[PDB]
Amino acid sequence: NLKPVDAMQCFDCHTQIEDMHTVGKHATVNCVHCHDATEHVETASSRRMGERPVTRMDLEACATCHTAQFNSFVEVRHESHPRLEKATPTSRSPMFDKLIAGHGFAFEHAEPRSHAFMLVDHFVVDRAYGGRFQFKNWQKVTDGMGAVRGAWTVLTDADPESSDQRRFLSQTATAANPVCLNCKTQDHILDWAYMGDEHEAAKWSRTSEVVEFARDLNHPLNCFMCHDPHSAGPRVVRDGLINAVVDRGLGTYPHDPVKSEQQGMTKVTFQRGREDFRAIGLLDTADSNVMCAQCHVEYNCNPGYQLSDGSRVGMDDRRANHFFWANVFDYKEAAQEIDFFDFRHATTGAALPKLQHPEAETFWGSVHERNGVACADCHMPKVQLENGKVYTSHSQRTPRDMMGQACLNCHAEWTEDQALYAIDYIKNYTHGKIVKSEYWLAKMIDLFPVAKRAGVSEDVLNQARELHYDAHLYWEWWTAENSVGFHNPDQARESLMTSISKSKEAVSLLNDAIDAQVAV
């Protein structure tokens, strides 16, 4: 049974923690629930750690007093199809392989499933670790609670004796790197310096061997990613988000200075040896838009290349951990701002960006966002009870499963079927434009080998490659973004029409150049 420790004795050294803990809703929650610090207390000084105290990162540290939120969080939505490859005619991007050729995502890119699995899914996807990690057997794929208890309780490593990234099966890639983990877990929150910079007090950084890092990590989406464990107040912990909002002064709502002021973020920094080490961002309000934007954004978390001279940008560069914090129409400028692109297309040779799930940046400026609606209103609403203490659902999922709480409470004029029909109208229309965008991208891509072999000039191929960048960006934003346009249908429509326009321009350029070569 837990025995409380004397918190005043801790606070003698830990004034920041004292200021947070004594004022918030965890003022009565003793340190022993999450820390074992006995030897630490015996050996620390005011400025030196002494023996390192143990800190619990497991979600069950919160489940004892908040069982309802924990149980809701770990639920598995079986209707969210698992391991469903997006590059197929019946999923999000029928022509993904041709369009993304040259990028690691061609090796596998499945649709998202329930949050319980995020860390295990990261470890087992074919593009990440060369097939090194697998579930212990194919039955463990169902075990959300198990994954939450710890990735290594349900996974196996094909070679515990080596720590290099390599292929264990032929059609895999080794794209994982330590930055990825920041959107899967924060078990390393005390072992990672802000941004993953090299730091004397950090065991792990952007330049770590990712297989060794992986082995030290266990829990998905820790409860404390949105909730400070000391104050119980709302926060974010993701360095890339704090860097965009605070360091770069862009604000929580870059398009709305007023809302940014009302719903802002305060950066709090913790030191090691009186040098800045790690940071969190306390939120003015419990604003799920910013909490969910710790992960549901477009980012760099990988090496790449410079647009200016084509040279390599490695994990050691700060650009390998970057939140663009830009909507689709500002993205190209944001990538120019850091002089960066992701890969060269295998067929066209164009410098291209790789876009990832930009839900937060898409939602900006939408009718719902402009009316003060936030991700949680549609995806983790309050539970409605005939008799009971209300709490907030923590099962983040499509609103189709709770339409009464997620839509119909605001849209009293609609039945559930009418609301679903409205969502499907947008998704059907947006998906048709994604498919047409891919058709035109594919037609362009197919012309590159023909043009090269017909002797079309480098100057013309380069003009086409410049068109490819835009045609790609204005399409791939939408296959990466998970709402199939629902989060911002006018923007999706404008962007996809721009993609098509750019592809058509490139097709015309290439056809005319091929025809001129043939005619000579």
**Closer Cβ to a second copy, 200 or 386, answer by number:** 386
The option from ligand HEC, Ca ion, ligand O=N[O-], none interacting with 232 (CB < 5 to 8 A, set by class) reads ligand HEC
Taking the complex as a whole, how short is the minimal distance between the CB of residue 153 and a second copy, in angstroms?
14
* Count of C-beta atoms within a 10 Å radius of residue 283: 22
Closest C-alpha among 176, 216, 175 to residue 192: 216
Taking the complex as a whole, how short is the minimal distance between the CB of residue 517 and Ca ion, in angstroms?
36
Tokens of 305: 């290349």
**Contact with a second copy (CB under 8 A): which of 16, 17, 18, 22?**
22
Closest C-alpha among 499, 466, 462 to residue 480: 499
Could you say whether residue 297 binds ligand HEC (CB under 6 A)?
A: yes
Number of residues forming the site for Ca ion (CB under 5 A): 5
**8 A C-beta contact, residue 474 and residue 498:** yes
* 10 annotated as ligand-binding: yes
- Please report, as residue ranges, which positions from 129 to 168 form the binding site for ligand HEC (by CB under 6 A): none
**Closer Cβ to a second copy, 45 or 170, answer by number:** 170
The option from ligand O=N[O-], a second copy, ligand HEC, none interacting with 494 (CB < 5 to 8 A, set by class) reads a second copy
The option from ligand HEC, Ca ion, a second copy, none interacting with 338 (CB < 5 to 8 A, set by class) reads none
Closest C-alpha among 9, 66, 82, 11 to residue 33: 66
Sign of the CA dihedral 45, 46, 50, 55?
A: positive
Could you say whether residue 302 binds ligand O=N[O-] (CB under 6 A)?
A: no
Amino acid found at 17:
I
The option from a second copy, ligand HEC, ligand O=N[O-], none interacting with 85 (CB < 5 to 8 A, set by class) reads a second copy
Strand partners, 305: 312, 341
Closest C-alpha among 250, 243, 220, 225 to residue 235: 225
Could you say whether residue 54 binds a second copy (CB under 8 A)?
A: no
Phi, psi for residue 187 in degrees, rounded to 5: -55, -30
**Contact with Ca ion (CB under 5 A): which of 11, 24, 110, 112?**
112
**8 A C-beta contact, residue 358 and residue 292:** no
Taking the complex as a whole, how short is the minimal distance between the CB of residue 105 and ligand HEC, in angstroms?
7
**Contact with ligand O=N[O-] (CB under 6 A): which of 69, 114, 134, 165?**
165
The DSSP call for residue 481 is S
As for the chain, the residues directly before each break of C–N over 2.5 Å are none
Inter-helix orientation angle 328-337/458-480, to 10°: 120
**Closer Cβ to ligand O=N[O-], 95 or 214, answer by number:** 214
Amino acid found at 264:
G
Could you say whether residue 209 binds ligand O=N[O-] (CB under 6 A)?
A: yes
Helices marked H in 371-457: 375-379, 403, 416-454
Residue carrying structure tokens 């990440």 = 128
Half-sphere exposure of 275 (CA within 13 A, CB side): 8
Residue carrying structure tokens 């040896």 = 273
Detail the DSSP E strand segments found in 89-132.
none
**Contact with a second copy (CB under 8 A): which of 56, 272, 414, 463?**
414
Taking the complex as a whole, how short is the minimal distance between the CB of residue 244 and a second copy, in angstroms?
30
Could you say whether residue 71 binds a second copy (CB under 8 A)?
A: yes
Distance of alpha carbon 504 from alpha carbon 437, whole angstroms: 10
Taking the complex as a whole, how short is the minimal distance between the CB of residue 489 and a second copy, in angstroms?
6
Closest C-alpha among 282, 287, 295 to residue 228: 282
**Contact with a second copy (CB under 8 A): which of 110, 189, 246, 408?**
110
The three-point CA angle 78-80-85 to 5° equals 125
Number of residues forming the site for a second copy (CB under 8 A): 104
Distance of alpha carbon 411 from alpha carbon 427, whole angstroms: 19
Strand partners, 351: 344
* 14 annotated as ligand-binding: yes
**Contact with a second copy (CB under 8 A): which of 66, 132, 354, 487?**
66
Distance of alpha carbon 125 from alpha carbon 140, whole angstroms: 15
Which window, 258-266, 356-364, 402-410, 491-499, contacts Ca ion (CB under 5 A)?
A: 356-364
Inter-helix orientation angle 489-519/416-454, to 10°: 20
Taking the complex as a whole, how short is the minimal distance between the CB of residue 464 and a second copy, in angstroms?
16
* 3 annotated as ligand-binding: no
**Contact with ligand O=N[O-] (CB under 6 A): which of 172, 356, 499, 503?**
356
Taking the complex as a whole, how short is the minimal distance between the CB of residue 178 and ligand O=N[O-], in angstroms?
8
Number of residues forming the site for ligand O=N[O-] (CB under 6 A): 5
Q: Whats the size of the chain, residue-wise?
A: 520
Contact code string over 63-102 relative to Ca ion, x by CB under 5 A: -----------------x----------------------
**Contact with a second copy (CB under 8 A): which of 312, 387, 459, 520?**
387
Which window, 40-48, 175-183, 195-203, 379-387, contacts a second copy (CB under 8 A)?
A: 379-387
**Closer Cβ to a second copy, 305 or 391, answer by number:** 391
**Contact with ligand HEC (CB under 6 A): which of 246, 286, 307, 435?**
286
**8 A C-beta contact, residue 196 and residue 205:** yes
* 188 annotated as ligand-binding: no
**8 A C-beta contact, residue 242 and residue 281:** yes
Could you say whether residue 398 binds Ca ion (CB under 5 A)?
A: no
Binding residues: 10, 13-14, 26, 31, 34-35, 40, 62, 65-66, 115, 180, 183-184, 223, 226-227, 230, 292, 295-296, 298-299, 354, 356, 368, 375, 378-379, 394, 407, 410-411, 487
Binding residues for Ca(2+): 298-299, 354, 356
